[PDB]
Amino acid sequence: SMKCKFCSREAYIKIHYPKMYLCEEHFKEYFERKVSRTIERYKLLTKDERILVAVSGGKDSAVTAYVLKKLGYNIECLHINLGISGYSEKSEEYAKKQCKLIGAPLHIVRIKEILGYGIGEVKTRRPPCSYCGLTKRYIMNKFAYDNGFDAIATGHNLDDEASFLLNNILHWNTEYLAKGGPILPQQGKFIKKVKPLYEVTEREVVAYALAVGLEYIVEECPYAGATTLDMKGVLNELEEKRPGTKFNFVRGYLKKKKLFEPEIKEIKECKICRMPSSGDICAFCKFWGLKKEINFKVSSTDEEPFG
Ligand SMILES: [Zn+2]
Ligand SMILES: [Zn+2]
């Protein structure tokens, strides 16, 4: 109970699969090997690829960027500052401190600077979270496309997958349920999106961040009581009662995911930015009322202006 399975050092955490108590260093190894297997299993990345990590200042993206760097991947990071007064400044400061420790270049996009408004400052009854998700997802893909990155890696973990799944099944969001899993392959101007933490729990992510010295922000905004926090608690209660519930729900989902494909509405190029649009002008451009394209091509980072 008190000691590590592979050494005489004090146990740091208890790992359920396989059953084992691991010290700080054997946990780090376990974790990294788990991420490494997820990459190979779903053929997520190759070491020749230039990977962009979307870093929010939260633990999930911090850990994603940290483990990919440790594994030997070619990674660069992107932080999207949402311009939320009293939130966005510390979020950026957190993301900078993380990328300095990781030793990865950090690119910053300030929404307030390019668009004029922060998330929650736009005159709309539309909840800040919906248009924020739209904004982040667009900036991530366009920054990556504009700078010739081959793949985007996000920090979503098993708990995020299972919670997103439960919410969407409860609202029967079958379109969202067709576009799921650890990899959204590269299609047109959509850059390949990957989730290397897909098979690791939020608990394991928290323990990794603390053991390697990563400091992160819990809340990215003051606009997040949403369903996901309720779903995670639900799934945790079901997981402590029936161990293997979360894994099975996601494993089962990946096998049946096919059934939701006919629900997909059959994707042209935007007339403003030339990015994937369902209509004449894409949702991002239509929302922000843009008549001009945003060029995310960078010659260098702010912390390394001469490289
Ligand atoms: Zn040990
Ligand atoms: Zn557009």
Curated annotation (Swiss-Prot):
Pathway: tRNA modification
Keywords, in A-Z order: 4Fe-4S, ATP-binding, Disulfide bond, Iron, Iron-sulfur, Magnesium, Metal-binding, Nucleotide-binding, RNA-binding, Transferase, tRNA processing, tRNA-binding, Zinc
Gene Ontology terms describing biological process: tRNA wobble position uridine thiolation
UniProt catalytic activity: 5-methyluridine(54) in tRNA + hydrogen sulfide + ATP = 5-methyl-2-thiouridine(54) in tRNA + AMP + diphosphate
A Pfam short name: TtuA_LIM_N
GO function term, MF aspect, one: 4 iron, 4 sulfur cluster binding
Positions bound to ATP: A54, I80, K136, G155
Binding site for Zn(2+) 2: C270, C273, C282, C285
Positions of [4Fe-4S] cluster binding: C129, C132, C221
Function: Catalyzes the ATP-dependent 2-thiolation of 5-methyluridine residue at position 54 in the T loop of tRNAs, leading to 5-methyl-2-thiouridine (m(5)s(2)U or s(2)T). This modification allows thermal stabilization of tRNAs in thermophilic microorganisms, and is required for cell growth at high temperatures. Can use free sulfide as sulfur source in vitro, which may be also the sulfur source in vivo.
Record text on subunit structure and interactions: Homodimer.
Family: Belongs to the TtcA family. TtuA subfamily.
Full protein name: tRNA-5-methyluridine(54) 2-sulfurtransferase
Provenance organism: Pyrococcus horikoshii (strain ATCC 700860 / DSM 12428 / JCM 9974 / NBRC 100139 / OT-3)
Gene: ttuA
